[PDB]
């Protein structure tokens, strides 16, 4: 039930509200992104962060912000600069870092 | 079958042999290549270049070589550098021009 948990939960909710289509909602598969598992080395998504919150696996806001950033940086590497994904990713990285301070 | 028709028919078989899988054989579609026609404005491939050869549409070597470099370029733009796809185009492009010199 913890206070770090309470803070993380609301940064998540807030962060996820910027992803209407839940492009960042779930793990990415190779079926929907050919090459992905061999170009992205450490997967991250909003569904996966939700669960590390629930299991007290974040100990600091620092750790949580790290994975968020690892999620946008995976999308901005894999997706071409012109896509809904690369754009969305860059937007939310800068704004979500703005939000958490 | 004009003299220009014989030269180009020769250059074509020579190029298309550098591409054992057929990556270039046929026109790409957005079905197989998501958002392809919202980046590449003037699409190209071997099968099209063969059909113009037949049709006598190429009035010189220079114009055949422009289609080749069009089809090579198109691929380096669409595809990511780390891909099988971009690498064959980039290889085949510089070889091609030399071979046809």
């Amino acid at each position: 039930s913890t206070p770090i948990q309470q803070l993380l939960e609301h940064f998540l909710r807030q962060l996820q509200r910027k992803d209407p289509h839940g492009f960042f909602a779930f793990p990415v598969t190779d079926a929907i992104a050919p090459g992905y598992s061999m170009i992205i080395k450490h997967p991250m998504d909003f569904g996966t962060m939700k669960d590390k919150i629930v299991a007290n696996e974040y100990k600091s806001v620092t750790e949580f912000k790290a994975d968020f950033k690892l999620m946008c940086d995976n999308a901005m590497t894999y997706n071409r600069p012109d896509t809904v994904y690369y754009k969305l990713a860059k937007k939310i990285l800068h704004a979500g870092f703005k939000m958490m301070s | 079958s004009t003299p220009i028709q014989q030269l180009l028919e020769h250059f074509l078989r020579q190029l298309q042999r550098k591409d054992p899988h057929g990556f270039f054989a046929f026109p790409v579609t957005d079905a197989i290549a998501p958002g392809y026609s919202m980046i590449i404005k003037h699409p190209m491939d071997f099968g099209t270049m063969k059909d113009k050869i037949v049709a006598n549409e190429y009035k010189s070597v220079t114009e055949f070589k422009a289609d080749f470099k069009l089809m090579c370029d198109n691929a380096m733009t669409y595809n990511r550098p780390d891909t099988v796809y971009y690498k064959l185009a980039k290889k085949i492009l510089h070889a091609g021009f030399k071979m046809m010199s």
Binding site: V28, I32, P34, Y85 | Y36
Partner: peptide, 6 residues
């Protein structure tokens, strides 16, 4: 709608 050709 995501990715390259594969």
């Amino acid at each position: 709608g995501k990715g390259g050709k594969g």
